[PDB]
Amino acid sequence: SHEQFRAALQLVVDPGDPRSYLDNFIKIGEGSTGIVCIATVRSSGKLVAVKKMDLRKQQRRELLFNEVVIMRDYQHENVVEMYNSYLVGDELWVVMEFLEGGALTDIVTHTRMNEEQIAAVCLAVLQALSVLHAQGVIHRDIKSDSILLTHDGRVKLSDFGFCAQVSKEVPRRKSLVGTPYWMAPELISRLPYGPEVDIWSLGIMVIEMVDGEPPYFNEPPLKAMKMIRDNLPPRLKNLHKVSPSLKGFLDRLLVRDPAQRATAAELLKHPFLAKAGPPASIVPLMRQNRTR
Ligand SMILES: C[C@H]1CN(C(=O)c2cn(-c3ccnc(N)n3)c3cc(C#CC4(O)CCCCC4)ccc23)CCN1
Q: Which domain covers residue 260, as residue numbers?
């Protein structure tokens, strides 16, 4: 029931009607079940990000609990910070840190990044993923859209709307959750899975950064999933010279067998991440800067 869901959600969100201390909502994104707005904290003038989920439009409701609960009080340099969560009418509102730099999707679909830039993104995501995996947090939506940047190029992991929590007692999830093109093969095959699905999704995002799009992106999503399930681990098709470290790096991420796929803590030591540039190397790629 809808009101049954709204009632349970009211117990886990913060109390209050946040429309009191926020105004000047500017819509900047749409996710098919919700939107995302820039808002102004009326008491300080600072800008925050506010995402509003239409409760009536959630295929499966438990996911909204995951994000608001798992992310409350979470602090990491490479993770977008959630300030508060509120139930407003038929919408869940998440008030979070606003990243003015926007998504990595805008960079990857317009220009090809150099290895120093790709290494910098990988390092930021892997640092966030290693801390999250250690606490049992599975992101389940790693892609370019889930990467947000500051104006000076700092990488922050975003969109924990599909995240989940595993423990020593229940160490695996089984929900069919994620974006079809970045989904791990064990997940598409409807097997139980753990944090290793994020490592595969990261490997697909490397292909994004090199090739501009994930494999099979021209195909409909259900077609891409059948192909991920049955085909061999993609390697870069963007056949412009790639360094051997990047080649060896991707070979540790895009492993069909999750038990053989490298973990986040293992990849933090990989030679490819030595290529990582400073956050400033991301800056020229952003739309506000790349045409000057
Ligand atoms: C096509 C797009 C549609 N999208 C958007 O429009 C989004 C834009 N932002 C922006 C943008 C700029 N700055 C910020 N701070 N957020 C989003 C943040 C989240 C999120 C989240 C959290 O889970 C992170 C951990 C704490 C709790 C909340 C989700 C979606 C968006 C998503 C990508 N695909």
A: 99-292
Q: Are 117 and 23 in the same domain? A: no
The preferred substitution site among 38, 41, 48, 51 for testing ligand 1, maximizing ligand atoms within 8 Å of CB, is: 51
* Residues 96/82, Cβ–Cβ less than 8 Å: yes
Q: Name the residue at shortest CA distance from atom 22 of ligand 1.
A: 159
Active-site residue numbers?
A: 141
241 C-alpha vs ligand 1 centroid, how far in Å?
33
35 is in an annotated binding site: yes
Q: What is the experimental method? A: X-ray
Closest atom, ligand 1, to C-alpha of 161? 23
